[PDB]
Amino acid sequence: SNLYKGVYELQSLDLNMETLNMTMPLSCTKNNSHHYIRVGNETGLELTLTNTSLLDHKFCNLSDAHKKNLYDHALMSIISTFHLSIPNFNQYEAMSCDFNGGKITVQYNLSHSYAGDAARHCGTIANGVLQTFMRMAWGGSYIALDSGCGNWDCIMTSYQYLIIQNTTWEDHCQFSRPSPIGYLSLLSQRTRDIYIS
Amino acid sequence: SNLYKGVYELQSLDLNMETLNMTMPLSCTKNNSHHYIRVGNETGLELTLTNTSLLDHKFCNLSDAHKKNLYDHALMSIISTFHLSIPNFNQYEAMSCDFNGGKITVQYNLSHSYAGDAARHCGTIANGVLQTFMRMAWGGSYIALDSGCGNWDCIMTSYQYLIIQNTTWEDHCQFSRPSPIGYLSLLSQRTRDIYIS
Amino acid sequence: SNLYKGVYELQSLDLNMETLNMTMPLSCTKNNSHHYIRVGNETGLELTLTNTSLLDHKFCNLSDAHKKNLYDHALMSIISTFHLSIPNFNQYEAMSCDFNGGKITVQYNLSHSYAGDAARHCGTIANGVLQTFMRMAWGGSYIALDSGCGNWDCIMTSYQYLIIQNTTWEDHCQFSRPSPIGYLSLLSQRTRDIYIS
Amino acid sequence: GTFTWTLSDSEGNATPGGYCLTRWMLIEAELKCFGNTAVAKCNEKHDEEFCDMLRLFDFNKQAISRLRSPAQMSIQLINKAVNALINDQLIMKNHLRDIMCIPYCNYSKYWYLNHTVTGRTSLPKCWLVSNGSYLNETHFSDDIEQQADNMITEMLQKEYMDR
Amino acid sequence: GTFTWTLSDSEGNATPGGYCLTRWMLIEAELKCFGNTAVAKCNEKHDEEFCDMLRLFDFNKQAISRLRSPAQMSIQLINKAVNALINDQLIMKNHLRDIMCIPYCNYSKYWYLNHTVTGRTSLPKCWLVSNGSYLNETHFSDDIEQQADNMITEMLQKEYMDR
Amino acid sequence: GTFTWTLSDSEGNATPGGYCLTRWMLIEAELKCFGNTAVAKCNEKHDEEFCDMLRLFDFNKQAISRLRSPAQMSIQLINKAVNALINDQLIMKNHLRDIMCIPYCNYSKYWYLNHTVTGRTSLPKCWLVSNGSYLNETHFSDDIEQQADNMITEMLQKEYMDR
Ligand SMILES: *[C@@H]1O[C@H](CO)[C@@H](O[C@@H]2O[C@H](CO)[C@@H](O[C@@H]3O[C@H](CO[C@H]4O[C@H](CO)[C@@H](O)[C@H](O)[C@@H]4O)[C@@H](O)[C@H](O[C@H]4O[C@H](CO)[C@@H](O)[C@H](O)[C@@H]4O)[C@@H]3O)[C@H](O)[C@H]2NC(C)=O)[C@H](O)[C@H]1NC(C)=O
Ligand SMILES: *[C@@H]1O[C@H](CO)[C@@H](O[C@@H]2O[C@H](CO)[C@@H](O[C@@H]3O[C@H](CO[C@H]4O[C@H](CO)[C@@H](O)[C@H](O)[C@@H]4O)[C@@H](O)[C@H](O[C@H]4O[C@H](CO)[C@@H](O)[C@H](O)[C@@H]4O)[C@@H]3O)[C@H](O)[C@H]2NC(C)=O)[C@H](O)[C@H]1NC(C)=O
Ligand SMILES: *[C@@H]1O[C@H](CO)[C@@H](O[C@@H]2O[C@H](CO)[C@@H](O[C@@H]3O[C@H](CO[C@H]4O[C@H](CO)[C@@H](O)[C@H](O)[C@@H]4O)[C@@H](O)[C@H](O[C@H]4O[C@H](CO)[C@@H](O)[C@H](O)[C@@H]4O)[C@@H]3O)[C@H](O)[C@H]2NC(C)=O)[C@H](O)[C@H]1NC(C)=O
Ligand SMILES: *[C@@H]1O[C@H](CO)[C@@H](O[C@@H]2O[C@H](CO)[C@@H](O[C@@H]3O[C@H](CO)[C@@H](O)[C@H](O)[C@@H]3O)[C@H](O)[C@H]2NC(C)=O)[C@H](O)[C@H]1NC(C)=O
Ligand SMILES: *[C@@H]1O[C@H](CO)[C@@H](O[C@@H]2O[C@H](CO)[C@@H](O[C@@H]3O[C@H](CO)[C@@H](O)[C@H](O)[C@@H]3O)[C@H](O)[C@H]2NC(C)=O)[C@H](O)[C@H]1NC(C)=O
Ligand SMILES: *[C@@H]1O[C@H](CO)[C@@H](O[C@@H]2O[C@H](CO)[C@@H](O[C@@H]3O[C@H](CO)[C@@H](O)[C@H](O)[C@@H]3O)[C@H](O)[C@H]2NC(C)=O)[C@H](O)[C@H]1NC(C)=O
Ligand SMILES: *[C@@H]1O[C@H](CO[C@@H]2O[C@@H](C)[C@@H](O)[C@@H](O)[C@@H]2O)[C@@H](O[C@@H]2O[C@H](CO)[C@@H](O)[C@H](O)[C@H]2NC(C)=O)[C@H](O)[C@H]1NC(C)=O
Ligand SMILES: *[C@@H]1O[C@H](CO[C@@H]2O[C@@H](C)[C@@H](O)[C@@H](O)[C@@H]2O)[C@@H](O[C@@H]2O[C@H](CO)[C@@H](O)[C@H](O)[C@H]2NC(C)=O)[C@H](O)[C@H]1NC(C)=O
Ligand SMILES: *[C@@H]1O[C@H](CO[C@@H]2O[C@@H](C)[C@@H](O)[C@@H](O)[C@@H]2O)[C@@H](O[C@@H]2O[C@H](CO)[C@@H](O)[C@H](O)[C@H]2NC(C)=O)[C@H](O)[C@H]1NC(C)=O
Ligand SMILES: *[C@@H]1O[C@H](CO)[C@@H](O[C@@H]2O[C@H](CO)[C@@H](O)[C@H](O)[C@H]2NC(C)=O)[C@H](O)[C@H]1NC(C)=O
Ligand SMILES: *[C@@H]1O[C@H](CO)[C@@H](O[C@@H]2O[C@H](CO)[C@@H](O)[C@H](O)[C@H]2NC(C)=O)[C@H](O)[C@H]1NC(C)=O
Ligand SMILES: *[C@@H]1O[C@H](CO)[C@@H](O[C@@H]2O[C@H](CO)[C@@H](O)[C@H](O)[C@H]2NC(C)=O)[C@H](O)[C@H]1NC(C)=O
Ligand SMILES: *[C@@H]1O[C@H](CO)[C@@H](O[C@@H]2O[C@H](CO)[C@@H](O)[C@H](O)[C@H]2NC(C)=O)[C@H](O)[C@H]1NC(C)=O
Ligand SMILES: *[C@@H]1O[C@H](CO)[C@@H](O[C@@H]2O[C@H](CO)[C@@H](O)[C@H](O)[C@H]2NC(C)=O)[C@H](O)[C@H]1NC(C)=O
Ligand SMILES: *[C@@H]1O[C@H](CO)[C@@H](O[C@@H]2O[C@H](CO)[C@@H](O)[C@H](O)[C@H]2NC(C)=O)[C@H](O)[C@H]1NC(C)=O
Ligand SMILES: *[C@@H]1O[C@H](CO)[C@@H](O[C@@H]2O[C@H](CO)[C@@H](O)[C@H](O)[C@H]2NC(C)=O)[C@H](O)[C@H]1NC(C)=O
Ligand SMILES: *[C@@H]1O[C@H](CO)[C@@H](O[C@@H]2O[C@H](CO)[C@@H](O)[C@H](O)[C@H]2NC(C)=O)[C@H](O)[C@H]1NC(C)=O
């Protein structure tokens, strides 16, 4: 449109959010099944959407993680923030975790929609997980299996598991630019949306 | 007073909050012992203040409600929001619930003020329940047994039970206009006021 | 500097926050090891930083405190607010409490940094306690063993215990003026900083 | 004509001289139209019961129109929306006033000054209740007079050449 | 003369030229009176340590006068009141500054510019502390000069005919 | 030249005509400098994606410079800082818009009007995205025109003698 009721240019900006890396986590998208969180120098989390499973335990050994420690700080805070932002989740077998050398490895088991095709539509804990996932990383989360706007909740995707693991900070942010906003959105307010009791 | 330092009229408005019915709950007052919450098309909750009792169980079967499901969504969220907005309540027998066909039926047992006349003045869980009740529905809550302003907390009313059940949405809002504000007040901030630990 | 681009004086104020005593708690500093909270007429809490121990129980008898009652209201709310503002604390033996005539007496056991010298640097629950302590009372908290700014968290002080007890309201606020701000800071937002699960 | 208080991408009602409250916003009659320069106050004031209701209605319209929302009202969307929309601090101030015997807003009734000579309005402000009912304009008093002063000021500052 | 920052229903001290801080608000002397047009800034600024203390005192007065509050201070009323009254965001900014070695407000001391020729004031702003004590006016410096510019502007915009 | 949006004690960049965004704030080139009277809007507006990013960068600079933060990023400091810095309400509004198919800000891209004749700028405002990508200026449209009106107004009110 050039000028706007006088001589004015738009002169746009694109912020280098990467330089915020040393103080708060930055999330991004790599491809359809992978999202990442940078938490410090050469370190961060890998968020994987898959149909396979790594952890067959039904226990989440938090009593060890918070007593024996031996875990990475900050990465633990991020996963706890994420986990506790999910509505209506208790455990229900899903969300088991193993810190005995696998450290932060935790998995959500989205398959608990049960049956097949949309199953527990608008009720599955899987949607609670997906909605939290899409806040942890957002904007660039649209290429995940969540598809279509104006369709809030009741997503019912085809991936069976969400697996979260610690990784190195390689140049993973190929689909979307890194941003502190996802983490800040989960952290800020939360909205509680407890359901339970 | 007519005009105000020039020619001005007051021209008042009265908002039709009912049209907000399809997106968020609306609470109102029917009469001294009854308050209601609309949650959707032809559906909502009935809040009853009484001296009788329907549920003689001392169990609140939430482990079934959140595992077997078979419950109405939204209505469950409203009661959980309400319940968790009460300060200092644990269970203390009171607040048992039965979802085995009675669905949302829950009751608070305000009689746990003990003794008679004002008893555990400024300490009973009943006041925690009454104060939460008067936020769930407010403005028109003044005809409930809570009586006198400038007397915060230490209400000590004569009803023995608060019973919450699912109802149909009949034209219940005879004493006060429906409003989203009560729910929003409980939801927003909460103030925590935990007491426990 | 006298006048400021015209004739202006600075005319400073110093607020008498003490007159706020009858509605909300006021915290202050007495000396290096002692801080206080006023909660009402001739009553408040004593916060002691020491190397001795009064309570050798490893139990925090809250199940009695919130069931048998027999405890002071408001003082209980303040300690619960304080306690629940500490990040990552579970119990870990520390934070036992005894209300059987000792009423609010609770102690935090800062010695769980383990070893000696800075030990579990940036990880001890003791720092969680110290940071909460320095919000309960602040500004004048600098003479406590926390020393040096620009060194956030990882404080690792030399006191072994934080003991909180009910006292009379004597003229304790000798080092700093009483202020509602400490309590308000803990109460407001909290920041959650849960860590656990 | 765009607003910051709206969730819509300037979809409408920000340009035709003002924003109109329709018969489904109002219980009585229709089209109470507030000039855009008045409505725009809701863009930044951050403390007004009327503006807070206005945002809540704007949400409702968008949520119904775009989501349909059969069966459930998506209470979980609301939980997100309130943190985005409702000015929690004000709600609690009105709550305290009820506790304290101080006239407070229960959000149903509003008043405004209408300069019927020209048709300009001040925007609605809450009428307030106490002791179970509405206040008289005779005790409400001075706040009306103060609102008139503000409109007077606007009409003088309205001069384009200066002021 | 009405305020939005007050909980009262315009009970008083909004009309007699200004709002006075009494000897129970102040440790020293009495009646530090701030003109109503200055005080009114607390109605909408939404970020000022002085205004936040002002609301807290207003609450205290109403709570004691109307509730009596024998035995207990109704800490639960306070929990409601703070969400209504205290500007949490500002409190945390001052907290961070303490952590960070940046001068911060501990809320006890305020300064203002007093144009003693006419008696107008800027309203108090926090004096700030660092390294365990109060700052010198010589390092505080420019912020005073900037506040003076604001008062100068007001005195020129005070002209009724225009500006 | 001091700001309220900054955590620093007026350490710098509030006085040399404006605040500059450096090459580590920007991905492209360097020194996008916004005049102080424009930047100052972030002191009180309380609702702007650009200003919120500006505070977040200011924090980052102070946190790194003063704390060093080896090994850990002190996520717990961040939890305190966000309550102090990020305007939660706005973040949720952009979140709702994504849910609702309404163009929303993902915070990476901003636009402003640059009156290159004189060099004045409006400050950045978020460009917005929808359907996975950025909007055209042709649909963005009127909001630009409205921003131009605001700059026009400022240039006329800039007159020192009056207005
Ligand atoms: C807010 O929303 C916007 C809109 O979707 C997001 O913008 C995208 O951001 C990603 C990541 O920065 C960009 O991805 C890049 O795509 C390039 C493809 O090249 C073709 O398309 C571009 C489009 O502009 C043409 O200019 C070009 O000529 C080609 O036709 C890749 O080549 C890029 O690779 C390089 O960077 C990566 C970074 O990790 C390196 O690993 C590579 O080795 C290489 O150096 C890159 O993949 C995408 O193009 C942007 N889209 C648009 C429309 O601008 C924002 O990121 C989002 N913001 C936030 C914070 O979430
Ligand atoms: C904020 O606070 C105000 C003040 O208390 C509340 O206002 C009341 O709202 C209720 C519900 O809308 C009104 O109740 C009605 O009372 C009528 C009684 O008629 C006599 O009194 C009126 C008083 O104005 C005279 O005009 C009339 O001539 C009579 O002398 C009933 O006839 C009404 O019944 C009709 O509506 C109900 C709605 O459910 C239908 O079921 C009935 O079949 C019938 O059609 C009704 O009961 C009350 O009068 C209002 N009081 C005042 C002073 O205005 C606000 O509701 C409250 N706002 C919120 C959101 O909480
Ligand atoms: C914000 O931060 C400031 C700066 O640190 C704190 O200000 C201090 O507040 C304390 C408590 O009010 C003051 O303590 C007093 O010190 C006196 C020492 O006297 C010498 O030093 C003063 C310094 O001004 C000289 O004027 C004097 O001539 C001497 O050389 C004591 O004599 C005082 O004792 C009296 O008051 C106590 C109150 O409990 C009584 O018990 C005693 O019996 C006696 O009557 C008192 O101990 C301290 O001086 C202040 N420092 C400064 C630099 O001003 C703020 O309190 C803090 N605000 C908040 C809310 O936290
Ligand atoms: C603020 O004051 C103005 C001026 O009084 C109000 O405008 C007036 O509103 C009424 C009712 O909507 C209009 O009456 C119309 O009468 C015809 C028949 O004559 C009928 O067919 C229409 O349906 C309608 O009832 C009246 O013409 C209109 N006045 C002017 C000059 O246009 C305004 O409604 C008041 N407040 C607000 C917030 O709008
Ligand atoms: C802002 O500056 C003005 C002007 O200096 C201050 O007003 C002045 O305040 C003093 C102290 O309250 C008044 O002194 C009085 O003296 C008589 C005896 O002469 C005594 O009986 C009174 O009790 C009082 O001490 C002084 O008269 C008054 N000046 C004027 C012109 O009225 C003002 O207090 C300063 N700041 C604020 C916030 O009020
Ligand atoms: C708002 O518009 C003004 C006016 O166009 C922009 O100022 C201009 O910015 C460019 C790029 O920084 C300057 O170019 C310089 O060219 C010399 C060689 O001729 C080179 O050595 C420098 O490194 C630089 O590239 C240009 O001189 C400058 N114009 C003026 C009159 O000073 C401004 O950058 C735009 N927006 C913002 C937010 O700053
Ligand atoms: C992770 O989830 C699987 C369930 O995965 C799918 O969905 C189920 C509803 C069912 O149709 C499975 O066949 C699908 O593969 C858990 O495995 C089964 O869980 C069901 C109860 O829902 C149980 O009856 C089966 O016996 C389980 N399978 C076996 C071989 O025993 C799996 O245990 C979950 N793992 C964790 C750690 O939570
Ligand atoms: C609901 O509450 C009643 C208590 O109701 C009243 O208040 C009591 C303090 C006592 O004075 C009762 O007589 C009054 O009717 C519970 O019933 C009794 O509870 C007390 C302990 O408080 C116990 O000693 C009695 O034995 C109980 N009554 C009988 C017949 O056993 C009742 O159990 C509560 N129900 C639920 C579901 O919580
Ligand atoms: C309060 O803490 C002490 C621990 O205090 C110090 O730090 C320990 C790491 C150790 O070095 C002690 O010697 C120091 O005095 C608890 O007492 C001991 O706890 C350790 C486990 O950490 C255990 O092995 C010892 O046997 C305990 N001491 C004795 C005599 O049994 C003490 O129990 C804690 N008290 C409460 C109520 O929590
Ligand atoms: C993971 O495996 C399941 C089967 O166990 C796949 O489920 C369905 O597959 C058909 C055929 O591809 C689709 O048309 C259905 O829509 C799928 N179910 C759902 C709920 O969408 C599932 O597609 C596999 N997931 C992925 C991502 O490959
Ligand atoms: C996730 O964290 C673990 C724990 O630090 C990493 O595994 C360690 O790698 C170092 C490499 O020098 C070894 O010395 C340690 O013995 C390993 N620890 C354990 C428990 O095996 C792991 O590599 C990290 N994941 C990624 C992808 O970097
Ligand atoms: C509020 O209105 C309801 C419904 O009209 C009243 O409840 C009924 O009262 C009649 C009285 O003869 C009983 O026969 C019905 O069995 C009651 N029905 C239900 C569902 O309880 C209620 O009593 C009224 N309350 C007040 C204070 O007047
Ligand atoms: C429910 O039953 C109890 C008795 O078990 C009634 O308690 C008292 O009744 C007397 C006489 O009516 C009143 O003057 C007292 O004030 C009542 N107690 C309290 C705490 O107020 C009680 O009134 C009955 N409740 C209702 C609403 O009928
Ligand atoms: C509260 O909810 C229950 C559960 O839906 C309602 O009871 C059902 O009513 C339908 C009517 O067609 C029957 O077909 C179902 O079999 C009933 N379910 C059960 C568990 O009995 C109940 O009517 C609702 N309460 C009110 C007042 O509407
Ligand atoms: C802070 O002041 C208190 C009270 O004056 C000091 O506590 C007393 O110290 C004397 C020293 O001879 C003991 O005999 C008392 O038994 C102590 N009383 C109590 C209740 O502890 C305290 O030691 C002072 N702290 C500092 C750092 O000086
Ligand atoms: C409490 O006792 C412990 C020993 O059990 C003291 O620990 C160290 O003491 C030496 C010598 O005074 C110091 O130089 C060390 O710095 C202390 N440890 C730590 C973590 O700082 C401890 O000083 C005693 N505490 C007090 C306040 O007296
Ligand atoms: C902390 O609270 C307890 C409980 O009230 C106080 O102890 C009581 O003191 C009165 C004094 O008249 C005695 O009659 C009570 O019998 C005591 N109660 C118990 C359980 O022993 C104690 O004094 C308070 N602490 C301080 C320092 O005041």
Numbering used by the authors:
A (entry chain C), B (entry chain A), C (entry chain B): 59 to 255
D (entry chain a), E (entry chain b), F (entry chain c): 260 to 422
Can I see the authors' text?
The LASV glycoprotein complex (GPC) mediates viral entry and is the sole target for neutralizing antibodies. In its mature, native form, GPC is a trimer of heterotrimers comprised of the receptor-engaging subunit GP1; the transmembrane-spanning subunit GP2, which contains the GPC’s fusion peptide at its N terminus; and the stable signal peptide (SSP), which remains non-covalently complexed near the membrane-proximal region of GP2 post-cleavage. We present the development and characterization of prefusion-stabilized, trimeric GPCs of LASV lineages II, V, and VII, revealing structural conservation despite sequence diversity.
We focus on LASV lineages of public health concern including lineage II, one of the most common lineages that circulates widely in southern Nigeria; lineage V, which circulates in Mali and has decreased pathogenicity compared with lineage IV; and lineage VII, a newly described lineage isolated from a nosocomial infection in Togo with comparable pathogenicity to lineage IV. The resulting soluble constructs feature sequences of circulating lineages II (LII; strain NIG08-A41), V (LV; strain Soromba-R), and VII (LVII; strain Togo/2016/7082). Combined, these approaches enabled us to determine the structures of GPC in a reproducible manner and yielded structures of LIV, LII, LV, and LVII GPC trimers at resolutions of 3.8, 3.7, 3.7, and 3.1 Å, respectively. Using the prototypical LIV GPC as reference, we note RMSDs for pruned and all sequence-aligned pair as follows: 0.78 and 1.9 (LII), 0.85 and 2.0 (LV), and 0.73 and 2.4 Å (LVII). While 12.1F maintained binding to all GPCs tested, 19.7E showed minimal binding to LV GPC and weaker relative binding to all other lineages. We observe that mutations at residues 112–114 are likely to be responsible for the loss of 19.7E neutralization against LV. In the unbound state, LV residues 112–114 (gold star) extend further away from the β-sheet surface and would need to be displaced by an average of 2.1 Å to adopt the same conformation. To test this, we expressed the LV GPC-I53-50A with a D114N mutation (left). Indeed, the D114N mutation restored binding of LV GPC-I53-50A to immobilized 19.7E, validating our structural observations and defining the molecular determinant of Soromba-R GPC’s resistance to 19.7E binding.
